[PDB]
Amino acid sequence: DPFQVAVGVSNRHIHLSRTDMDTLFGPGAELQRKKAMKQPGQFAAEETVTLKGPKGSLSKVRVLGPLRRETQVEVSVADGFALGITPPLRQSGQLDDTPGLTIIGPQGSVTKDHGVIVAQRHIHMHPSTAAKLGLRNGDEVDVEAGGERGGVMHRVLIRVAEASADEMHIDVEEANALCLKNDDVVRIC
Amino acid sequence: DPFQVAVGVSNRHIHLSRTDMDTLFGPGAELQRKKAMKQPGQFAAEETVTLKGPKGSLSKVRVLGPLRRETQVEVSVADGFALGITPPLRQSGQLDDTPGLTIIGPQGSVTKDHGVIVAQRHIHMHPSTAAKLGLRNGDEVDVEAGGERGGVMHRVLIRVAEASADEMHIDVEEANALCLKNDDVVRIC
Numbered sequence: 001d002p003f004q005v006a007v008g009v010s011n012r013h014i015h016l017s018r019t020d021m022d023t024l025f026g027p028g029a030e031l032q033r034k035k036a037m038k039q040p041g042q043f044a045a046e047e048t049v050t051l052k053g054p055k056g057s058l059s060k061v062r063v064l065g066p067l068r069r070e071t072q073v074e075v076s077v078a079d080g081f082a083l084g085i086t087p088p089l090r091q092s093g094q095l096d097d098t099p100g101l102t103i104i105g106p107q108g109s110v111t112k113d114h115g116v117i118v119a120q121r122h123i124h125m126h127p128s129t130a131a132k133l134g135l136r137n138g139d140e141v142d143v144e145a146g147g148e149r150g151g152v153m154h155r156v157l158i159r160v161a162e163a164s165a166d167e168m169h170i171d172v173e174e175a176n177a178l179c180l181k182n183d184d185v186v187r188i189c
Numbered sequence: 190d191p192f193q194v195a196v197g198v199s200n201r202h203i204h205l206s207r208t209d210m211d212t213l214f215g216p217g218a219e220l221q222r223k224k225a226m227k228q229p230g231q232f233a234a235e236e237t238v239t240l241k242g243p244k245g246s247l248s249k250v251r252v253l254g255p256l257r258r259e260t261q262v263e264v265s266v267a268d269g270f271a272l273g274i275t276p277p278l279r280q281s282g283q284l285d286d287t288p289g290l291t292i293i294g295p296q297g298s299v300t301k302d303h304g305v306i307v308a309q310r311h312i313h314m315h316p317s318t319a320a321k322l323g324l325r326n327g328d329e330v331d332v333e334a335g336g337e338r339g340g341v342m343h344r345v346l347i348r349v350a351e352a353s354a355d356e357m358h359i360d361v362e363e364a365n366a367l368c369l370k371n372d373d374v375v376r377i378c
């Protein structure tokens with residue numbers, strides 16, 4: 001069944017620019033791969049940061065490599081409340097009018113004015129697969145999960161790129177709400 | 190639309206036996222009302238406890254009144270993970286083969302061998318409403334939630350009792366996963 005995609009539960013994490021990486025970890029510092037992810041080229045790094053908000057802070061927030069053009073922080077709704085901000089629901093890269101935080105690293109700190117979002121659930125899909133299912137990049141779909149806490153998720157963003165592996169990304173709260181874990185199978189409706 | 194029902198977002202909390210109330214807060218100690226809930230006679234009390242598990246503790250956990258015949262602890266999956274336990278998904282009062290933890294109050298502590306659960310989402314329903322919708326106690330329904338993070342929750346238990354107001358109860362993670370909040374309106378399918 002080509003409609004079955006595996007689940008990747010995305011914990012809170014951060015993408016860093018080269019400039020911000022230099023500030024937080026020192027000039028010329030390279031991310032060290034800790035664990036390779038399903039999406040090709042992407043990985044969880046050894047490096048982590050502390051996120052400080054007006055209300056509180058979060059420690060050991062994972063940095064995901066590779067480095068990107070713009071810094072982006074992804075936190076759960078609960079994470080936001082603990083920090084003392086209200087990050088809006090957004091797809092990756094949609095950072096206009098988003099709130100900021102203070103990122104703290106070993107070599108320095110940077111207080112961002114934007115880049116913090118709650119991740120909108122989505123499916124990374126190969127263009128081959130997307131072509132089969134008659135799905136276009138930018139589409140939204142329904143996804144069903146089984147089990148004692150199962151249900152159907154609306155507004156699942158379809159993300160098609162050549163450098164993609166078939167996988168669904170949901171944050172920790174979405175996963176727990178449906179009793180989903182890494183490598184669980186869900187179905188596109 | 191009579192199939193619509195208001196949402197009550199349920200944060201972690203505890204119900205206490207009289208015996209356990211005596212231990213934690215002193216013999217003869219009465220729960221003090223802070224804020225009444227929508228369910229008749231029930232209320233969030235001024236009293237709070239600390240929950241201690243093998244891995245960590247949670248402070249300021251709300252006690253809900255009135256007292257009951259058996260102590261019951263409701264926590265989210267995330268809460269359980271932080272405590273160092275794995276509570277199963279259960280309906281209220283369904284406490285067979287459940288993990289325990291240590292409850293700490295001002296006057297003493299008690300270590301329970303059972304009674305910790307992750308709450309199964311449910312709808313409290315007055316018999317008149319139940320008769321009008323064609324629902325019975327113990328039935329399970331689907332509930333649709335709208336909005337950017339909307340979707341359809343499966344396996345929603347119907348709890349029919351005279352001392353009930355029409356209201357759906359979901360925990361913090363289920364609420365955040367769907368961007369629901371208190372007094373939001375969802376619809377029974």
Ligand SMILES: [Zn+2]
Binds near residue numbers: 013015064074
């Ligand atoms: Zn990300």
Ligand SMILES: [Zn+2]
Binds near residue numbers: 122124169
């Ligand atoms: Zn993703």
Ligand SMILES: [Zn+2]
Binds near residue numbers: 202253263281
């Ligand atoms: Zn309860």
Ligand SMILES: [Zn+2]
Binds near residue numbers: 311
């Ligand atoms: Zn309830």
